[PDB]
Amino acid sequence: ERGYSFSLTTFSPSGKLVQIEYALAAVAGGAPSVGIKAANGVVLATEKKQKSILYDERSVHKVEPITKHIGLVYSGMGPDYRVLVHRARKLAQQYYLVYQEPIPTAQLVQRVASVMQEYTQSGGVRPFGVSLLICGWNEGRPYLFQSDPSGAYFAWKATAMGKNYVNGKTFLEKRYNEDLELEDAIHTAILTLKESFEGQMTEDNIEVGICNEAGFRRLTPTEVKDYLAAIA
Amino acid sequence: SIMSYNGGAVMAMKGKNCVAIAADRRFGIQAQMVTTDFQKIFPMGDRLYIGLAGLATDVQTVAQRLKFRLNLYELKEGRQIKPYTLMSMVANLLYEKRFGPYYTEPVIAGLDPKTFKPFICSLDLIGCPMVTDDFVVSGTCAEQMYGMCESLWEPNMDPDHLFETISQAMLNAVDRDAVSGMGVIVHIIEKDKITTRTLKARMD
Amino acid sequence: TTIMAVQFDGGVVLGADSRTTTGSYIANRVTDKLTPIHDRIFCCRSGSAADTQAVADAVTYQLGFHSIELNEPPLVHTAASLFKEMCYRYREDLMAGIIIAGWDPQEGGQVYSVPMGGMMVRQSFAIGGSGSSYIYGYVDATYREGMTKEECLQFTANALALAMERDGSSGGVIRLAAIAESGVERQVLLG
Amino acid sequence: TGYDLSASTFSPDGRVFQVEYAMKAVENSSTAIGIRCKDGVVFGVEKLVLSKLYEEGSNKRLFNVDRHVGMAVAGLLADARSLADIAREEASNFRSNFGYNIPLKHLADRVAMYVHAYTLYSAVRPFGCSFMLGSYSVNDGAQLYMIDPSGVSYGYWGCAIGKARQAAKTEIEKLQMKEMTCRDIVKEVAKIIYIVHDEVKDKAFELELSWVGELTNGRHEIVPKDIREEAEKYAKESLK
Amino acid sequence: SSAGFDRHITIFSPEGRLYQVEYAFKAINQGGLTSVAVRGKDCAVIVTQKKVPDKLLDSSTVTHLFKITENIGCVMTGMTADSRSQVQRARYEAANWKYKYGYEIPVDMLCKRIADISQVYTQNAEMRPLGCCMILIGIDEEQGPQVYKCDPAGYYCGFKATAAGVKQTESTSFLEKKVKKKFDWTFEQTVETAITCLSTVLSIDFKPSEIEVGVVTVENPKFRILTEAEIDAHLVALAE
Amino acid sequence: TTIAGVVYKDGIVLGADTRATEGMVVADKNCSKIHFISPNIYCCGAGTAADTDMTTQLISSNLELHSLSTGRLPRVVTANRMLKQMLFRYQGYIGAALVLGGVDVTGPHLYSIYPHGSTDKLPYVTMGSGSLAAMAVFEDKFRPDMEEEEAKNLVSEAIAAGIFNDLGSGSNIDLCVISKNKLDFLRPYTVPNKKGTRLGRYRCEKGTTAVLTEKITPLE
Amino acid sequence: SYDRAITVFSPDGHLFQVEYAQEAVKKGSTAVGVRGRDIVVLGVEKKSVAKLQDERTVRKICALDDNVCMAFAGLTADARIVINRARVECQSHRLTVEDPVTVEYITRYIASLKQRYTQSNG
Amino acid sequence: YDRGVNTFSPEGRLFQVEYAIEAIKLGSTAIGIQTSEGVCLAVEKRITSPLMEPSSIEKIVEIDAHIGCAMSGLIADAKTLIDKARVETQNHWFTYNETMTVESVTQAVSNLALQFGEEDSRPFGVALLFGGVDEKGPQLFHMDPSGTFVQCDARAIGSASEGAQSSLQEVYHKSMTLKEAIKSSLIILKQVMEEKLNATNIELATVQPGQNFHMFTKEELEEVIKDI
């Protein structure tokens, strides 16, 4: 290529970054999701409707581990999501190369936020329209970290992202609290997912990851249809 | 040898709930000593020391580089360091110069940051870690300190007899050695406190 | 050590001992000295072990890639040219005793040899390895032009038999290979 | 209208006009045809003298890339010269790296990918050329390929590049192409060139005929057209 | 909702869109081509027609079934240059897999890698995002036959009844109406449903000389291209 | 240092001796040379210890990466290809005598790796300094498709003959069992060499040493 | 790098950025300086402090060597970078030639650097 | 931005090259005159202030022991070209033990008079007057920003160059002398300048074969002025 290398992101007269704001709007136009930190574990849950009845649900997988105890989902576009996933994979493996110990979630979010901020600033490329929901049970206390296309990050007791995320957030603020267990977290996660999802919700419309202190676990539709069989 | 260019000897000994590390004080060129106050034991955080023996060039160099990376780690992550993490870091920094190697044998002596578990290990000049439970040694004299520590060590030791065992071991093993002498510094630490003693060694 | 490749009317006949040695101690008592590349084209190696393994792997890479881009069966002279290029271009370091053989639909059976220099030539029979000199002494005695398959099998059998008997590094077990128009027929003689 | 400028942009209906503008550039150039017989391929170009300034033997669009492969270009000439040099370079690579003759399929694929890379980006323009590729092998026979300015490359028995693209293959297709040797196809190409555009818009044209196959034993060269002089004594009989 | 330069380059529009990639989803539609993939049981069937109006144009060189590896076949739609370039990238990355990893590449991983490469061409601007659609097939041990699709957006998926091109909204509606009955798919059921779904979409009921059929089956996991005779045998076997 | 490998009727039994010598002195009496790679694959090393450790940790990270990218169980031949390509890249500089073992979908597969990069698929190998004693015990007493305790006793007896040969270890010989479902790992397998107790002892006293400068520093 | 010219000529033969960028200096703080027969004297005006704050770090007059004196106007950060560059340059002059740095040499350096800095790409 | 650095005209030459030729015009005038006795040269400093110290502003620079110069318009670009021209003549001395002749000097400058490029920066804004004494006697050379190098017998540049060339063509012939050409030049100078002609407006630079060194006149130029 030529390598023209000027950034398309310049400040407004107002002081805003309209490409980042449009990327945030494209995120908000994406698929819904929910993530809840409980007292012992952290539960992530997505909402996976196929477009037609032809599609298979064993090929693409939303809930994705990065290490044996680190879960990560998104709300946005898969072709960016997989790129940042693979980048985080290589990054965490390099950390384990250096220190020979599993990487803490704060360090993951520091390095991923730095990379994504670099993609905000660098020349001519678009930012990634993906909002992550990163979690893991590191040294007893689990965590829950939400990032954004602006490269920033936060930490939530529980949050939701996608369509009607403000509605799900108002429901989480009322229904959830500080102290529950993993199964009750799954229950209120299915409830706040079913508030905004479609009417036909099955074992394949959702896909749920949990984070035990023993490690990450990605649930199967066997136990999902065990649990979501008219869960309340 | 190249390790026997400036002398040097570092002893570490694991006690019951505490850990003791000691080293020599002599510095000089091959036959001519210079001074009696050269530092070879360096504080890396709290209740956790490191020792370097061999060429003093790599001693000061690797001490500064490890302090560099350590302060970068403790400022990037607010907690203090675990000793296995420090051991992996030392192994990485020594393994970076695979064909340009440093001439030192690091010994890490530290406690647990959460519990009072002691920790001793030693590494080679390319970065081979090696954890034990009794003692690790380095430097020019080896078999001297090996025979003394295999002669004198007990598994469960109060810090006083730990101190006296490591004192007699260093004194006799250094007095048998030629190029390394001129006083011994002793660090005995535990969870509660840090004690640093200097011994009246034979000045010959 | 001692490797040998003989063509005939229908196809070619390969052969080797196994006995990969180091110093005076044998590291491996039985060894696939001959290696498939394509489904019709083999090579047998000598000299150093890992070097020829890496060369055979890279030739496998380029040759399979080329053969798929042709959408055709590849030539044996093509793989011979590839071995010639990879041997000669960075020679200086490697000890290759590569003999290329295989049946071809356009050209029948062919046998090429690449010695340690990096040159290439087509022959009707080939030796290779340190213990190859003796049966090279009588391969120009016992051979007759226009053999059958079983005559080639017996021919290489007697050859590698005396090579394994006489040479100190050679020995072990006999591996043979029959490649023609029809199929790949490998067998192992022993005892 | 606003999107036809860059070579990287798409249109609101989904096509690239830069490629289309490159395609119809060669349409105004001279007529260049090609056809194979059962043991060879014959090329043919209606080539024009400007008025009186040419020398009848300069700047031949009938190229000769490999020992058995040459081009029959049409369009902007210098771009065709450069692309022919790239083809010579690729054939040199294949001969140096494998030691035998390049098959025409893989060569056409490499040239098509090269043209494709020059159609992708915004820094360069797509090529304004359209050419022919013909060859012969003893184990492959006669092969005739065809490359547009976009880079789509596949095989024909016959083709025509120029004004009379349809109007040549109108009567190229009624030729009994399998059962004829290429020595008949010499005067066949002569009559097909001679029928189209004798005197209507221009004053004069001139004929060259490139020629590869089994009769040249795999060599590729222009015919000695003066030898057997097949056009003119047939062209004067093909006006009636 | 054109604000600034969203109509030209890969930036974000108001409200969440970007126009270039959704301009490229109808870049397949100017191919004028239809492809249907079928996975009902341990075989896998591709079917795709040609459109050759010419007698001077060949037929072996027009086939869109592209054998990537010995156990991996695929089919292309859209423009030909992007298709063939994506094909060489796929072949090259499959050879990279086989050298680096010591065994045969799974068809899922390859489609993931091509999706990543499509993102690479999608992420940086001033780069034309290859408007072609790739459908892959392959046999896996412990998983059977597989069907995957590569989008120009790099959004891959993999599923049983698969069809993309020009007319496949209607074809996927028929495949919703067709893969809802739970009968088995005993390989002639698959071939017959592929032929009849294409023959209900286009409604032509034509010769075996227009469609190419690619198969792979768990009895011979090598990729296989069908012959005119057995294609005719299937067509007359579904002729009642 | 004497590592050896074998393949029984289902999987692979590995053994090692854990005397980490530095020159002429026994520097360690317990050094794990049985290394992690994957849930199904391990590796054992010899020669230069730090090079083997850094190499096996690098390849373990790479295979964790590739498997988690894949989403299924790794293959042994992928590890074989990675190790041989790396060690041939370093042109025989890095000394890594490696024994590679795991059970795939295809089953048990055992490899030997020489530090130039030459790899061999074998039912039983020995590597290390006293490897000849274990190769003696194998070539004496091997038969194909043995049972579990037969193979474990054989490998243990092999490393035992190596330890009764020179440069063995003081340790309780390490073993490892890999089967298709059950992974096992045994550090204190059998102690033939009990430490003889001192009838001494070499005593001292709290104040038999002169002290020049003491210091006190409290902590939290 | 950036393949773009900021220095494009005018339709009447001028520079849109050079003489026009002189206006940022013309909209700055004032500073004068003279030379006596032995003593030189200079200074800046318009401190404009907040009357309760520090100003020892906002000093607009520094030195590069013990023999040369500095002043500027315009925006301050360009002067900061040019002063650091000139410090390193006059010290490198001190490295090669063991004279005190002549004022003409360092002014040639600053003027030539600012010139080629305008001459470069973007 | 209105057809920038790399686009021709529908009728003629490039935009920015034309703009460089226009940007010459704002500079001060200068007149060089070749005579077979030797090359003289003059310039107008255009001094504004009494603070503007006259001997600091350079127009005549010294390339070599027998090569002078005169500049136009832009100053520091001209200084860069002067420095590098001295470097290249010094290379020619280093590699041939002789003098790089003035035509070869100007060709070495005009190798990159037009090498303006921002990709794969701008054209320069100075027209240079070159004088020297080669083996073929005196030489007078005029280049341009467009690199179109030509020999001139007596060239005038910059502002008021039309009437300068006209009034120079009124007075010139081939067999002139030195001091005649000097006073004929400064008459045209005080015809084209706006101030009173005195010692601080102008400066002269004269090279002869026997007077190769010191291509300059210092304060005897006042005597030269008062003889009009």
UniProtKB/Swiss-Prot annotation, chain C:
Subcellular location per the Swiss-Prot or TrEMBL entry: Cytoplasm; Nucleus
Active site (UniProt): 1
Modification Phosphothreonine occurs at: 35
Highest taxon in the source lineage: Eukaryota
E.C. no: 3.4.25.1
EC primary class: hydrolase
Catalytic activity entry: Cleavage of peptide bonds with very broad specificity
A GO BP entry: proteasome-mediated ubiquitin-dependent protein catabolic process
Keywords: Acetylation, Cytoplasm, Host-virus interaction, Hydrolase, Nucleus, Phosphoprotein, Protease, Proteasome, Threonine protease, Zymogen
GO molecular function, one term: cadherin binding
GO CC annotation terms, alphabetical: cytoplasm; cytosol; extracellular exosome; mitochondrion; nucleoplasm; nucleus; proteasome complex; proteasome core complex
Induction: Down-regulated by IFNG/IFN-gamma (at protein level). Up-regulated in anaplastic thyroid cancer cell lines.
Record family assignment: Belongs to the peptidase T1B family.
Subunit: The 26S proteasome consists of a 20S proteasome core and two 19S regulatory subunits. The 20S proteasome core is a barrel-shaped complex made of 28 subunits that are arranged in four stacked rings. The two outer rings are each formed by seven alpha subunits, and the two inner rings are formed by seven beta subunits. The proteolytic activity is exerted by three beta-subunits PSMB5, PSMB6 and PSMB7. (Microbial infection) Interacts with HIV-1 protein Tat.
Protein name: Proteasome subunit beta type-6
Native organism: Homo sapiens
Curated annotation (Swiss-Prot), chain D:
Positions bearing N6-acetyllysine: 52, 201, 225
CDD domains xref list: proteasome_alpha_type_3
Positions carrying Phosphoserine: 238
GO molecular function, one term: ubiquitin protein ligase binding
UniProt-annotated location(s): Cytoplasm; Nucleus
Family annotation (InterPro entries): Ntn_hydrolases_N, Proteasome_alpha, Proteasome_alpha-type, Proteasome_asu_N, Proteasome_sua/b
Keywords: Acetylation, Cytoplasm, Host-virus interaction, Nucleus, Phosphoprotein, Proteasome
UniProt keyword annotation of Phosphoprotein present: yes
SMART domains, per the entry: Proteasome_A_N (SM00948)
Subunit structure: The 26S proteasome consists of a 20S proteasome core and two 19S regulatory subunits. The 20S proteasome core is a barrel-shaped complex made of 28 subunits that are arranged in four stacked rings. The two outer rings are each formed by seven alpha subunits, and the two inner rings are formed by seven beta subunits. The proteolytic activity is exerted by three beta-subunits PSMB5, PSMB6 and PSMB7. Interacts with AURKB. Interacts with CDKN1A. Interacts with MDM2 and RB1. Interacts with the C-terminus of TBXA2R isoform 2. Interacts with DNAJB2. (Microbial infection) Interacts with HIV-1 Tat protein.
Protein name: Proteasome subunit alpha type-3
Organism of provenance: Homo sapiens (Human)
Curated annotation (Swiss-Prot), chain E:
Chief localization: cytoplasm
Glycosylation sites per record: 1
InterPro entries, alphabetized: Ntn_hydrolases_N (IPR029055), Proteasome_alpha (IPR050115), Proteasome_alpha-type (IPR023332), Proteasome_asu_N (IPR000426), Proteasome_sua/b (IPR001353), Proteasome_subunit_alpha6 (IPR034642)
SUPFAM superfamilies per UniProt: N-terminal nucleophile aminohydrolases (Ntn hydrolases)
Keyword annotations: Acetylation, Cytoplasm, Glycoprotein, Nucleus, Phosphoprotein, Proteasome
GO cellular component, one term: nuclear matrix
GO term, biological process aspect, one: proteasome-mediated ubiquitin-dependent protein catabolic process
Gene Ontology molecular functions: endopeptidase activity; NF-kappaB binding; purine ribonucleoside triphosphate binding; RNA binding
UniProt subcellular location: Cytoplasm; Nucleus
Residues found modified as Phosphoserine: 13, 59-60
Modified residue annotations for Phosphotyrosine: 155
Keyword NADP: no
Domain of life: Eukaryota
Positions of post-translational N6-acetyllysine modification: 98, 100
Keyword Glycoprotein among UniProt keywords: yes
Subunit structure: The 26S proteasome consists of a 20S proteasome core and two 19S regulatory subunits. The 20S proteasome core is a barrel-shaped complex made of 28 subunits that are arranged in four stacked rings. The two outer rings are each formed by seven alpha subunits, and the two inner rings are formed by seven beta subunits. The proteolytic activity is exerted by three beta-subunits PSMB5, PSMB6 and PSMB7. Interacts with ALKBH4.
Family, per entry: Belongs to the peptidase T1A family.
NCBIfam families for this protein: PRK03996.1
Protein name as annotated: Proteasome subunit alpha type-6
Organism: Homo sapiens (Human)
Gene name as annotated: PSMA6
UniProtKB/Swiss-Prot annotation, chain H:
Database matches in NCBIfam families: PRK03996.1
Biological processes annotated in GO: proteasome-mediated ubiquitin-dependent protein catabolic process
Induction (free text): Up-regulated in colon cancer cell lines. Up-regulated in fetal Down syndrome (DS) brain (at protein level). May be the target of the transcriptional activator NFE2L2.
Family the UniProt entry places it in: Belongs to the peptidase T1A family.
Pfam families: Proteasome (PF00227), Proteasome_A_N (PF10584)
Compartment(s): Cytoplasm; Nucleus
Glycosylation sites: 185
Tissues where the protein occurs: Expressed in fetal brain (at protein level).
GO CC terms: cytoplasm; cytosol; extracellular exosome; extracellular region; ficolin-1-rich granule lumen; nucleoplasm; nucleus; proteasome complex
SUPFAM superfamilies: N-terminal nucleophile aminohydrolases (Ntn hydrolases) (SSF56235)
Keyword Nucleus set for record: yes
Subunit structure: The 26S proteasome consists of a 20S proteasome core and two 19S regulatory subunits. The 20S proteasome core is a barrel-shaped complex made of 28 subunits that are arranged in four stacked rings. The two outer rings are each formed by seven alpha subunits, and the two inner rings are formed by seven beta subunits. The proteolytic activity is exerted by three beta-subunits PSMB5, PSMB6 and PSMB7. PSMA5 interacts directly with the PSMG1-PSMG2 heterodimer which promotes 20S proteasome assembly.
Keyword hit for Secreted: no
Coiled coil: none
Protein name: Proteasome subunit alpha type-5
Location of Phosphothreonine modifications: 48
Gene3D superfamilies (UniProt xref): Glutamine Phosphoribosylpyrophosphate, subunit 1, domain 1
Sites of Phosphoserine modification: 9, 49, 56
Highest taxon, organism lineage: Eukaryota
